[PDB]
Design an enzyme around this catalytic site. Structure first.
Site, PDB file in Angstrom:
ATOM      1  N   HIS A  38      -5.992   7.471  -3.000  1.00 53.04           N
ATOM      2  CA  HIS A  38      -6.837   6.532  -2.387  1.00 53.04           C
ATOM      3  C   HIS A  38      -6.624   5.721  -1.234  1.00 53.04           C
ATOM      4  O   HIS A  38      -7.096   5.220  -0.472  1.00 53.04           O
ATOM      5  CB  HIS A  38      -7.747   5.610  -3.343  1.00 53.04           C
ATOM      6  CG  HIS A  38      -6.843   4.369  -3.625  1.00 53.04           C
ATOM      7  ND1 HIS A  38      -5.653   4.324  -4.607  1.00 53.04           N
ATOM      8  CD2 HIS A  38      -6.962   2.940  -3.154  1.00 53.04           C
ATOM      9  CE1 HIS A  38      -5.260   3.132  -4.692  1.00 53.04           C
ATOM     10  NE2 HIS A  38      -6.020   2.159  -3.912  1.00 53.04           N
ATOM     11  N   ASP A  39      -5.194   5.696  -1.198  1.00 59.40           N
ATOM     12  CA  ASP A  39      -4.270   4.911   0.049  1.00 59.40           C
ATOM     13  C   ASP A  39      -3.456   5.780   0.631  1.00 59.40           C
ATOM     14  O   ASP A  39      -2.723   5.274   1.443  1.00 59.40           O
ATOM     15  CB  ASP A  39      -3.787   3.416  -0.293  1.00 59.40           C
ATOM     16  CG  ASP A  39      -4.843   2.227  -0.488  1.00 59.40           C
ATOM     17  OD1 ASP A  39      -5.634   2.271   0.437  1.00 59.40           O
ATOM     18  OD2 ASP A  39      -4.461   1.448  -1.456  1.00 59.40           O
ATOM     19  N   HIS A  72       1.709   1.615  -5.648  1.00 59.68           N
ATOM     20  CA  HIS A  72       0.317   1.290  -5.872  1.00 59.68           C
ATOM     21  C   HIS A  72      -0.643   2.436  -6.303  1.00 59.68           C
ATOM     22  O   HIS A  72      -1.372   2.125  -7.330  1.00 59.68           O
ATOM     23  CB  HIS A  72      -0.176   0.643  -4.551  1.00 59.68           C
ATOM     24  CG  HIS A  72      -1.704   0.479  -4.577  1.00 59.68           C
ATOM     25  ND1 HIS A  72      -2.232  -0.606  -5.157  1.00 59.68           N
ATOM     26  CD2 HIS A  72      -2.518   0.925  -3.734  1.00 59.68           C
ATOM     27  CE1 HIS A  72      -3.438  -0.783  -4.875  1.00 59.68           C
ATOM     28  NE2 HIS A  72      -3.783   0.041  -4.005  1.00 59.68           N
ATOM     29  N   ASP A  96      -8.238  -0.492  -8.143  1.00 62.36           N
ATOM     30  CA  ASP A  96      -7.614  -0.818  -6.912  1.00 62.36           C
ATOM     31  C   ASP A  96      -7.146  -2.308  -7.098  1.00 62.36           C
ATOM     32  O   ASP A  96      -6.013  -2.604  -6.458  1.00 62.36           O
ATOM     33  CB  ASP A  96      -8.544  -0.751  -5.757  1.00 62.36           C
ATOM     34  CG  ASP A  96      -7.912  -0.628  -4.642  1.00 62.36           C
ATOM     35  OD1 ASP A  96      -6.629  -0.214  -4.461  1.00 62.36           O
ATOM     36  OD2 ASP A  96      -8.496  -0.702  -3.370  1.00 62.36           O
ATOM     37  N   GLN A 100      -6.179 -17.747  -3.464  1.00 64.72           N
ATOM     38  CA  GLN A 100      -6.152 -16.938  -4.663  1.00 64.72           C
ATOM     39  C   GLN A 100      -7.330 -17.279  -5.767  1.00 64.72           C
ATOM     40  O   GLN A 100      -8.010 -16.137  -6.234  1.00 64.72           O
ATOM     41  CB  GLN A 100      -4.818 -16.856  -5.502  1.00 64.72           C
ATOM     42  CG  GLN A 100      -3.594 -15.930  -4.640  1.00 64.72           C
ATOM     43  CD  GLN A 100      -3.859 -14.463  -4.734  1.00 64.72           C
ATOM     44  OE1 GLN A 100      -3.976 -14.181  -5.913  1.00 64.72           O
ATOM     45  NE2 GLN A 100      -4.338 -13.998  -3.667  1.00 64.72           N
ATOM     46  N   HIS A 112       0.900  -1.311  -0.021  1.00 60.11           N
ATOM     47  CA  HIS A 112      -0.083  -0.010  -0.131  1.00 60.11           C
ATOM     48  C   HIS A 112       0.879   1.310   0.145  1.00 60.11           C
ATOM     49  O   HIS A 112       0.758   2.160   1.078  1.00 60.11           O
ATOM     50  CB  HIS A 112      -1.077  -0.094   1.050  1.00 60.11           C
ATOM     51  CG  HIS A 112      -2.106  -1.000   0.848  1.00 60.11           C
ATOM     52  ND1 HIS A 112      -2.143  -2.131   1.502  1.00 60.11           N
ATOM     53  CD2 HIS A 112      -3.185  -0.851   0.276  1.00 60.11           C
ATOM     54  CE1 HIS A 112      -3.172  -3.088   1.075  1.00 60.11           C
ATOM     55  NE2 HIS A 112      -3.861  -2.169   0.366  1.00 60.11           N
TER      56      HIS A 112
HETATM   57  C1  LIG Z   1     -13.734 -12.383   0.198  1.00 57.82           C
HETATM   58  O1  LIG Z   1     -13.269 -13.040  -0.927  1.00 57.82           O
HETATM   59  C2  LIG Z   1     -12.047 -13.684  -0.522  1.00 57.82           C
HETATM   60  C3  LIG Z   1     -11.403 -13.103   0.205  1.00 57.82           C
HETATM   61  C4  LIG Z   1     -10.089 -13.521   0.650  1.00 57.82           C
HETATM   62  C5  LIG Z   1      -9.631 -14.824   0.332  1.00 57.82           C
HETATM   63  N1  LIG Z   1      -8.395 -15.132   0.532  1.00 57.82           N
HETATM   64  C6  LIG Z   1      -7.142 -14.898   0.048  1.00 57.82           C
HETATM   65  C7  LIG Z   1      -7.451 -13.472  -1.102  1.00 57.82           C
HETATM   66  C8  LIG Z   1      -6.067 -12.519  -0.917  1.00 57.82           C
HETATM   67  N2  LIG Z   1      -6.342 -11.472  -1.272  1.00 57.82           N
HETATM   68  C9  LIG Z   1      -7.144 -10.349  -0.850  1.00 57.82           C
HETATM   69  O2  LIG Z   1      -7.925 -10.287   0.372  1.00 57.82           O
HETATM   70  C10 LIG Z   1      -6.956  -9.104  -1.659  1.00 57.82           C
HETATM   71  C11 LIG Z   1      -7.421  -7.808  -1.377  1.00 57.82           C
HETATM   72  C12 LIG Z   1      -7.026  -6.767  -2.466  1.00 57.82           C
HETATM   73  C13 LIG Z   1      -6.133  -7.156  -3.358  1.00 57.82           C
HETATM   74  C14 LIG Z   1      -5.546  -8.487  -3.384  1.00 57.82           C
HETATM   75  C15 LIG Z   1      -5.819  -9.380  -2.579  1.00 57.82           C
HETATM   76  C16 LIG Z   1      -5.541 -10.873  -2.346  1.00 57.82           C
HETATM   77  O3  LIG Z   1      -4.753 -11.521  -2.793  1.00 57.82           O
HETATM   78  N3  LIG Z   1      -5.928 -15.361   0.208  1.00 57.82           N
HETATM   79  C17 LIG Z   1      -5.849 -16.496   1.028  1.00 57.82           C
HETATM   80  C18 LIG Z   1      -4.652 -17.019   1.069  1.00 57.82           C
HETATM   81  C19 LIG Z   1      -4.374 -18.113   1.846  1.00 57.82           C
HETATM   82  C20 LIG Z   1      -5.551 -18.499   2.817  1.00 57.82           C
HETATM   83  C21 LIG Z   1      -6.992 -18.098   2.695  1.00 57.82           C
HETATM   84  C22 LIG Z   1      -6.850 -16.825   1.771  1.00 57.82           C
HETATM   85  C23 LIG Z   1      -8.280 -16.574   1.567  1.00 57.82           C
HETATM   86  O4  LIG Z   1      -9.147 -16.705   2.112  1.00 57.82           O
HETATM   87  C24 LIG Z   1     -10.448 -15.431  -0.974  1.00 57.82           C
HETATM   88  C25 LIG Z   1     -11.734 -15.113  -1.265  1.00 57.82           C
HETATM   89 MG   LIG Z   2      -7.146   0.844   0.463  1.00 59.39          MG
HETATM   90 ZN   LIG Z   3      -5.543   0.772  -3.013  1.00 59.95          ZN
END
Ligand SMILES: COc1ccc(-n2c(CCN3C(=O)c4ccccc4C3=O)nc3ccccc3c2=O)cc1
Ligand SMILES: [Mg+2]
Ligand SMILES: [Zn+2]
Length: 313
Positions: A106-107, A72, A217, A269, A68
């Protein structure tokens, strides 16, 4: 007035593409941003002296966090530039001005910690802003910088145009709160499918701008695989640090923030592409067809993550 920014040929051509990476030379990012304002907005949108002094004060107020950070800010503003340039006639003069600035800001002053960590820590900002904590802070920092002497880039707008642009920027920055994205896209999905979506309805424009901000974003997932793969390291570098800080508060973090569960990243992911990214660019592509390359690049990266799980990399 006749002073244009000009990029080397490879950057002049690639900056027009959605998947453009702004590169590792920090000293060129201000010039890349001004180039995008001049082409997106006009060489007359801002006083160059004031814009240059606004840009460098914004940069100063981003911190040395893995993800962040200032890079970014500029990356997210490039995605917005790509959306606006590919959708020339859809956006007002004020909106083009406001949205590139909103993206850059924004951040602002991000500490590398989620809204949830601020609340569990009992951070003062959690008392000042109960919801979208960091995003209300980011907007506050934006207004503070605009009010520094010599930094008001909107000075030559009328009182009503000025109020309109700060309102566009506030909604744009608040919308980057991912907790607000799901409901915003669900509503946009219903409006698009029942055919009620109306770009002359201000409440509808707000929703569409909100989704654009989510898309910009999250644009890490819309780069070519090697950029996406290497950016993921920075994203998880912050999450794991937040995880460590959760453990210091005597709270087991979610696996996503737990460095002891790196093995679970490839599957997390997939969940994120399927639950957040693909739906986000799908809905965006329906409303704004020329943003289809964001969706295609996102699907390409989903396929790359599926290959990681199958041990193919
Ligand atoms: C809400 O839906 C989701 C939310 C999170 C996840 N999730 C994720 C996503 C990670 N992630 C953000 O949150 C985010 C925000 C912004 C930019 C890039 C990203 C980005 O790469 N990684 C994991 C890795 C290991 C274990 C578990 C998880 C898990 O549950 C899956 C689905
Ligand atoms: Mg933000
Ligand atoms: Zn951002």
């Amino acid at each position: 007035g006749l002073m244009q920014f000009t990029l080397p040929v490879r950057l002049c051509k690639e900056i027009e593409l959605f998947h453009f990476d702004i590169g590792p030379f920090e000293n060129m990012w201000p010039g890349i941003f001004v180039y995008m304002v001049h082409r997106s907005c006009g060489t007359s949108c801002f006083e160059l002296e004031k814009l240059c002094r606004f840009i460098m004060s914004v940069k100063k107020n981003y911190r040395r966090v893995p993800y962040h950070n200032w890079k970014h800010a500029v990356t997210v503003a490039h995605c917005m530039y790509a959306i606006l340039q590919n959708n020339h006639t859809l956006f007002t003069d004020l909106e083009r001005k406001g949205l590139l600035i909103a993206c850059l800001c924004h951040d602002l002053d991000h500490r590398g910690f989620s809204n949830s960590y601020l609340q569990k820590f009992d951070h003062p900002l959690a008392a000042l802003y109960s919801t979208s904590t960091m995003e209300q802070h980011h907007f506050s920092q934006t207004v503070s910088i605009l009010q520094l002497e010599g930094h008001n880039i909107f000075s030559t707008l009328s009182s009503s145009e000025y109020e309109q642009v700060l309102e566009i920027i506030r909604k744009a920055i608040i919308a980057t709160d991912l907790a607000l994205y799901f409901g915003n896209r669900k509503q946009l999905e219903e409006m698009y499918q029942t055919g009620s979506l109306n770009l002359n309805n201000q409440s509808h424009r707000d929703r569409v701008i909100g989704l654009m901000m989510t898309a910009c974003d999250l644009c890490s997932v819309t780069k070519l695989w090697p950029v996406t793969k290497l950016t993921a390291n920075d994203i998880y570098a912050e999450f794991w640090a937040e995880g460590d800080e959760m453990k210091k508060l005597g709270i087991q973090p979610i696996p996503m923030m737990d460095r002891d569960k790196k093995d679970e990243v490839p599957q997390g992911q997939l969940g994120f592409y399927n639950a957040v990214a693909i739906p986000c660019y799908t809905t965006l592509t329906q409303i704004l067809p020329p943003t289809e390359p964001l969706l295609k690049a996102c699907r390409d990266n989903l396929s790359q993550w599926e290959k990681v799980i199958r041990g193919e990399e």
